[PDB]
């Protein structure tokens, strides 16, 4: 409450509308070596 | 300073009755020199607790003269501590010499001066000796604490009173309070060896019923007990808190009564001199 302290800024839209994180990169590292070979 | 309460026009009937209110006290809100009757006006009976709460936010003022037009008054305590004056005892009790007085809101209602012309009413509070105003405040607060010649409460502000009580009762528990609590049996065993000590511990003391039910081990030694001693500041906190406990719930004493010539005891509905403190 007091102290002119900082606040945790929450997602503006409801919680349901910000995606679960992920990582999509179909570039596979191993088979790339096999094709370059 | 002397407040000038101005009056509107009145029917010749109720002015004569108002003239007999020469010693009752009112409750202004602002302390200007000029003021009008409509300002100081309390609604009809109800909420003894809320009214008692609304007596510490405003300050009092007794009146001395009622002309057909204006109304003299006296700001009770703002700068005076020896200003002698007179006020009529409007309480159900008597007030002997020397004992202080306190303002308490009325009881049961039905004690209200109603003015037809102004269409308003006034509720002059009664004056009780401190020693019984404390007990009445205690009774009203205890009854208010049960909804978690008697009017029922409202639960609107009764919670505020219970809060004010539980705050002071919680802040009494300290690390030396447990030490002092440890000797309850070691105190009972003293209360049965002497008469006076026995009389100091009442019958419904709610702690004699503890020294027979519960056993407690010796308390753990404090963090760095060798440097400071806890029981003493515990007791100092208790003294300071109990000195101003009733004030926090009821009302502070406003004047002590003293008479030089007249007989000491003054019956109700009789004007008696007083000095203010």
């Amino acid at each position: 409450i007091p102290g002119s302290a900082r606040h945790f800024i929450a997602p503006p839209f409801p919680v349901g509308f910000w995606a679960r994180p992920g990582f999509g990169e179909g570039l596979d590292a191993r088979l790339a070596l096999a094709h370059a070979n | 300073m002397e407040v000038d309460i101005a009056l509107p026009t009145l029917s010749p009937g109720d002015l004569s009755a108002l003239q007999r209110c020469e010693g009752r006290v009112v409750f202004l809100e602002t302390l200007r020199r000029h003021a009008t009757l409509r300002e100081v006006a309390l609604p009809c009976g109800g909420d003894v607790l809320a009214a008692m709460a609304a007596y510490r936010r405003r300050f009092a003022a007794v009146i001395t003269r009622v002309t057909p037009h204006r109304m003299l008054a006296t700001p009770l305590g703002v700068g005076g501590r020896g200003q002698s004056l007179v006020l009529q005892n409007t309480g159900p009790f008597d007030l002997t010499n020397g004992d202080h007085v306190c303002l308490v809101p009325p009881l049961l209602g039905d004690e209200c001066l109603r003015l037809t012309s102004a269409n308003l009413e006034l509720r002059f509070p009664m004056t009780l000796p401190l020693a019984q105003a404390r007990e009445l405040t205690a009774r009203v607060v205890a009854r208010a604490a049960e909804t978690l010649q008697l009017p029922p409460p409202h639960r609107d502000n009764a919670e505020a009173a219970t809060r004010s009580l539980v705050l002071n009762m919680i802040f009494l528990l300290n690390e030396g309070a447990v030490i002092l609590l440890s000797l309850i049996p070691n105190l009972l065993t003293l209360g049965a060896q002497d008469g006076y000590a026995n009389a100091v511990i009442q019958l419904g003391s709610a702690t004699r019923e503890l020294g027979q039910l519960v056993r407690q081990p010796p308390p753990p030694l404090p963090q760095d007990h060798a440097r400071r001693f806890c029981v003493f500041e515990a007791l100092e906190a208790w003294i300071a808190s109990a000195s101003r406990l009733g004030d926090t719930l009821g009302t502070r004493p406003v004047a002590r009564v003293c008479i030089f010539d007249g007989p000491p005891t003054v019956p109700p509905g009789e004007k008696a001199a007083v000095v203010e403190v």
Partner: protein
């Protein structure tokens, strides 16, 4: 008429030639008993001789002008610091102000609060000074301008308060009220976080005869962040034992184990339930202390006008007792 006080003293903190008359002065306790009472008063875990050192670092001198004290706090507008520094004649003054700041910050840390170290006198009006030795004279009751100063330019005076610290309440709380005769309160604001703490001063006027809830709401953030960080450095034990739950079901039990008085040493009374109320490290009252105030008198008006100042109006000196504000 009004009655006065004269106290010969050292030109350490209140310097009656540097300021003109009409400003409140305070009386400072003898520091020996403060240093002593610390030894038993500082809480567990903290230091128990740091006030000793803080005082020894500032070496009778008895009075202190509010104009000087307000500078050695958190809240202050730097104009008044500059005034006190460059307008006081005295040697080594800024250093002394720094040391005094450290003193007060030690005082709150050691739970001997400065409100128990500074009684308040009236507003000074006169003084005769030798070389570094003064005799100030202040009112004590009655209204200020019943006095008679030996200025001969303005015989009477007024009361001057640094406008940087004057916090009004009614217009602040928006009571919708109308300014008549208002009280005057000098209030202190403590804050307790170990090695990171300070003191805030204010001068409050209002019609409120009982501050209480008014400050409790005004200083809400201070009380909040003071109740939780205040018990720090105190070793609390592990999770409280279930035996700590004070049994209530057993009061109006018709059938229960019972024991009359006079057989309580070690008889066959082993059957009573055990209850160990164990309170070690929780928030005590001195832990939740955040403010303290004291009534000063009654006031008509406040006008602001010049360094910024605040001239009182018909101040009537009526000093009261101190008060705690913890709940």
């Amino acid at each position: 008429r009004a009655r006065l006080i004269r106290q010969v003293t050292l030109a350490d903190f209140c310097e009656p030639q540097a300021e003109r008359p009409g400003l409140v002065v305070l009386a400072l306790r003898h520091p020996a008993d403060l240093a002593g009472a610390a030894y038993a008063a500082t809480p567990p875990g903290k230091n128990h001789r740091d006030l000793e050192e803080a005082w020894l670092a500032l070496d009778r001198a008895s009075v202190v002008s509010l104009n000087f004290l307000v500078a050695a706090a958190e809240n202050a507008d730097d104009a008044l610091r500059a005034h006190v520094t460059t307008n006081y004649r005295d040697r080594r003054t800024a250093a002394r102000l720094e040391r005094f700041a450290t003193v007060l910050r030690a005082m709150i840390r050691s739970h001997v609060f400065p409100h128990r170290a500074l009684h308040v006198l009236g507003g000074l009006l006169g003084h005769v000074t030798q070389d570094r030795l003064a005799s100030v004279t202040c009112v004590a009751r009655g209204d200020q301008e019943a006095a008679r100063t030996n200025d001969m330019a303005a015989r009477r005076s007024q009361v001057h308060v640094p406008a940087c610290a004057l916090m009004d309440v009614d217009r602040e709380l928006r009571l919708g009220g109308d300014d008549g005769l208002r009280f005057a309160y000098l209030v202190f604001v403590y804050t307790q976080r170990h090695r990171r703490e300070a003191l805030r001063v204010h001068v409050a006027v209002s019609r409120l005869p009982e501050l209480g809830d008014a400050l409790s709401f005004l200083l809400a953030g201070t009380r909040v962040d003071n109740a939780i960080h205040g018990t720090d450095e105190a070793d609390a034990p592990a999770a409280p034992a279930a035996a700590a739950a004070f049994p209530a079901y057993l009061f109006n039990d018709p059938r229960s184990a019972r024991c009359p008085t006079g057989r309580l040493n070690t008889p066959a009374a082993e059957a009573l339930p055990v209850w160990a109320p164990d309170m070690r490290g929780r928030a005590t009252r001195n832990s939740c202390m955040y403010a303290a105030y004291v009534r000063l008198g009654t006031v008509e008006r406040v006008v602001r006008r010049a360094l910024p100042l605040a001239h009182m109006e018909r101040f009537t000196w009526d000093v009261g007792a101190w008060e705690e504000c913890f709940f």
